[PDB]
Design an enzyme around this catalytic site. Structure first.
Site, PDB file in Angstrom:
ATOM      1  N   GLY A  57     -51.731   2.237 -12.244  1.00  0.00           N
ATOM      2  CA  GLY A  57     -50.975   2.947 -13.589  1.00  0.00           C
ATOM      3  C   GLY A  57     -49.541   3.253 -13.683  1.00  0.00           C
ATOM      4  CG  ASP A 115     -44.130  19.508 -14.607  1.00  0.00           C
ATOM      5  OD1 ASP A 115     -44.948  20.387 -14.921  1.00  0.00           O
ATOM      6  OD2 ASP A 115     -44.324  18.436 -15.145  1.00  0.00           O
TER       7      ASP A 115
END
Ligand SMILES: Nc1ncc(-c2ccc(S(N)(=O)=O)cc2)cc1-c1cc(F)c(O)c(F)c1
Length: 308
Positions: free
Chosen positions: A23, A148
């Protein structure tokens, strides 16, 4: 992309062989060292194109993720472990006609979003927080804030899934370059950055991230992990609405947090934590030991993370 088996030369001499593309702000491959190489225990991040955002993340790892610095910090703080992915090095590689930047990082397991709605045991939610606090103290000491934190960016280790790691430093920021803390300026144009569900209030106003913002996002996370929902989730399309709801929540602490909790569960420790967190000034150093006492008040040592 890049073909399997490609050989890469890091800037410390070492050679790495690519594996399967697992990915993807950059592409992620499994990695094998050529010297004393079975299963991939390393990973490679490779730049998407010319002049990308890898530089920011790359700089952070090079600056603070070195094993030397970490092993020293762990000894000084008496910690069992520190949830930063080990950094092995970076370099340049040539694909087609141009050079590219790559990172070599410790292999990790599954992320928390995939594991669990997103509701975990309260014991686990508190331990995740405590672990995240250690990571935040260290990176904040090294003039960097994450910006984040979320379930998706917490990963269990590959070899040890008992341990957890904060990942994805792309949106990380140097808040204290060379000991000089940034000044406070609200910027509506650079506003509402990060994941909207958990971004800090400072982020909503376009203020540059400082240490407290990281603490605030963690509190939001812990609330969401415990309750399975957040007040502002109904209206994520309007970021301003989200800022309002976050303000309201913090303005009316601790009942606002307490009211949110589903019957049979308590958000007492989380409410105190957000209280302690929302007290902080823009340039203030969080009291990490007090925050950790909040999430584990009894003082019984931490057990293995439970995802039953
Ligand atoms: N260090 C890592 N170790 C393992 C994975 C991974 C595991 C399983 C799977 S999957 N789809 O479940 O097969 C995918 C990726 C990803 C990273 C990683 C990649 C980045 F780009 C980062 O910035 C970062 F901090 C971490």
């Amino acid at each position: 992309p890049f073909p399997e088996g490609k050989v890469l030369d890091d800037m410390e001499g070492n050679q790495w062989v690519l594996g399967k593309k697992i990915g993807s702000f950059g592409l992620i491959y499994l990695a094998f060292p050529t010297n004393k190489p079975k299963d991939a225990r390393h990973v490679v991040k490779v730049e998407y194109q010319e002049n990308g955002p890898l530089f920011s993340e790359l700089k952070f790892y090079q600056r603070v993720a070195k094993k030397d610095c970490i092993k020293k910090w762990i000894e000084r703080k008496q910690l069992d472990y520190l949830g930063i992915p080990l950094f092995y090095g970076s370099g340049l590689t040539e694909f087609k006609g141009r050079s590219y930047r790559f990172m070599v990082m410790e292999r990790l397991g599954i992320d928390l979003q995939k594991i669990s709605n997103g509701t975990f045991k309260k014991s686990t939610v508190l331990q995740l927080g405590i672990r995240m606090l250690d990571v935040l103290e260290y990176i904040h000491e090294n003039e960097y804030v994450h910006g984040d934190i979320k379930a998706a960016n917490l990963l269990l280790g590959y070899k040890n899934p008992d341990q957890v790691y904060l990942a994805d430093y792309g949106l990380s920021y140097r808040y204290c370059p060379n000991g000089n803390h940034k000044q406070y300026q609200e910027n509506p144009r650079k506003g509402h950055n990060g994941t909207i569900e958990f971004t800090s209030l400072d982020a909503h106003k376009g203020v540059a991230l400082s240490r407290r913002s990281d603490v605030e996002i963690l509190g939001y996370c812990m609330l969401r992990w415990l309750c399975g929902k957040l007040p502002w989730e109904q209206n994520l399309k309007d970021p301003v609405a989200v800022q309002t709801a976050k303000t309201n929540l913090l303005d009316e602490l601790p009942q606002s947090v307490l009211k949110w909790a589903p019957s049979g569960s308590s958000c007492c420790e989380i409410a105190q934590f957000l209280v302690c967190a929302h007290s902080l000034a823009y340039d203030e150093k969080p009291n990490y030991q007090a925050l950790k006492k909040i999430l584990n008040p009894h003082g019984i040592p931490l057990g293995p993370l439970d995802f039953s």
